[PDB]
Amino acid sequence: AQQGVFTLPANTSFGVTAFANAANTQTIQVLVDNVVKATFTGSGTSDKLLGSQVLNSGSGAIKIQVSVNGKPSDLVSNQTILANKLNFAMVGSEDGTDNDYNDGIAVLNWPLG
Amino acid sequence: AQQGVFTLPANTSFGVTAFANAANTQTIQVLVDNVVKATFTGSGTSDKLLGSQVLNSGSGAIKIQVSVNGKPSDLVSNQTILANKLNFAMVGSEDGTDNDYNDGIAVLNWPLG
Amino acid sequence: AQQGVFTLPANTSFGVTAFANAANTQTIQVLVDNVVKATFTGSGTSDKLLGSQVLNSGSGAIKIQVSVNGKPSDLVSNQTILANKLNFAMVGSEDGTDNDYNDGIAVLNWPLG
Amino acid sequence: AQQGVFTLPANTSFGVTAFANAANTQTIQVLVDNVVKATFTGSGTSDKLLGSQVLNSGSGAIKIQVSVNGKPSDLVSNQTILANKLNFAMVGSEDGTDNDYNDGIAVLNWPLG
Ligand SMILES: OC[C@H]1O[C@H](O)[C@@H](O)[C@@H](O)[C@@H]1O
Ligand SMILES: OC[C@H]1O[C@H](O)[C@@H](O)[C@@H](O)[C@@H]1O
Ligand SMILES: OC[C@H]1O[C@H](O)[C@@H](O)[C@@H](O)[C@@H]1O
Ligand SMILES: OC[C@H]1O[C@H](O)[C@@H](O)[C@@H](O)[C@@H]1O
Ligand SMILES: [Ca+2]
Ligand SMILES: [Ca+2]
Ligand SMILES: [Ca+2]
Ligand SMILES: [Ca+2]
Ligand SMILES: [Ca+2]
Ligand SMILES: [Ca+2]
Numbered sequence A, B, C, D: 001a002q003q004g005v006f007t008l009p010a011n012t013s014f015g016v017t018a019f020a021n022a023a024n025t026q027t028i029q030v031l032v033d034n035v036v037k038a039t040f041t042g043s044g045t046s047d048k049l050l051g052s053q054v055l056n057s058g059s060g061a062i063k064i065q066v067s068v069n070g071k072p073s074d075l076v077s078n079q080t081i082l083a084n085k086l087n088f089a090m091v092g093s094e095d096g097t098d099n100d101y102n103d104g105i106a107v108l109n110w111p112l113g
């Protein structure tokens, strides 16, 4: 199945935070309506914080991409809702062979405020 | 039910990242074996990043506390596992009456490496 | 936080399946727009299947109640979305003191078809 | 990523319940330590309940397979833990082109009792 694709409410601010757990440099892109709106880049094996940003969801069509020097990683994802209100969308990825799926991570959360 | 309590594998590094979406100052504490090992503090209504740290899980007994000037918030939490390997533990909290449950957030992830 | 409350898409069929893991008789009610539309009753400690039904979501306001002889149980719940399409809403409950939270369970899933 | 693979605690009873939302006949197999221990078969587009069984987890290595007349479906899965105690493992699958991922579903839950 496609992974890293999420439908958010339209015209809503969301946070996105990215991490590396990898020797290779991760490129984590956040697409809103098929257009890259944020890019996080880096490496490190101890949950390196690559950045955190707030974006508008546009029509609601979000897609997360993870790659290493142009090669797409294998993604895994899901979305969880707590208290019928607090949403998280998580993405892990695997750039290699050890299948730890932590190499490049994105965590989205909404609503804000 | 108790919320914000998680059993991790013992002696394992994990990341914890904290956010505010609140006018009031949040105090988010990460306890390992009943001892506070990290504290994140701040306010802001746009997914303010309060910090991110890597901790050892000790025996595995983690507890997240959220309070505002000493008053415990109402917590909500769960844990998700992706690809049978990548773990997230999420905590939201409500400090007031609007029930957005985003006031003080913690996201834990493991394994690292 | 309130638990067992879920917002579904309006006018959508969903499945709901109920289980017991309890010595006491569980009463598991599925409310749509504040009106009970299904009730599952029984006991048994080996994941007793109490029933499975398909309901219309009405406006989308679903609430699950669990009680034992009129006494409300303590609920825990969340919602997960897989492949940006397949939804599950889960409810556990505790009727006693052992905090296994499995006494009366409901699992909702949608969309059907 | 591989999907439908879960690590359970060893020597633990778990419930597994299977559904169809499909015109084609689904074959849903539950493997414990690489050996099929339950098989659910059927079709129907309204959350047809194919069965529910309790199994021992063996070493803990569970795998869910879904196929239609021998052809493996595309699986999606995850695991959620509520109240640090109640576990669900969910599997959806797609046998065709509409990407509803509901064609053959398995829901696992533990602990029982
Ligand atoms: O980035 C390449 C490689 O780096 C490290 O060895 C580990 O983090 C691996 O999981 C990762 O796949
Ligand atoms: O922190 C107090 C209060 O601040 C803001 O008004 C909002 O973020 C509320 O959700 C929060 O409860
Ligand atoms: O139903 C009462 C009681 O019955 C059994 O002892 C167990 O299933 C308990 O978890 C439950 O709380
Ligand atoms: O089973 C084949 C096909 O049957 C129906 O048309 C729908 O349930 C589809 O989602 C499914 O893929
Ligand atoms: Ca890796
Ligand atoms: Ca890694
Ligand atoms: Ca609030
Ligand atoms: Ca808030
Ligand atoms: Ca109980
Ligand atoms: Ca029980």
Ligand SMILES: [Ca+2]
Pocket: D093, D094, D095, D096, D097, D098, D099, D100, D101, D102, D103
């Ligand atoms: Ca299908």
Ligand SMILES: [Ca+2]
Pocket: C112, C113, D021, D022, D100, D101, D102, D103
């Ligand atoms: Ca279908």
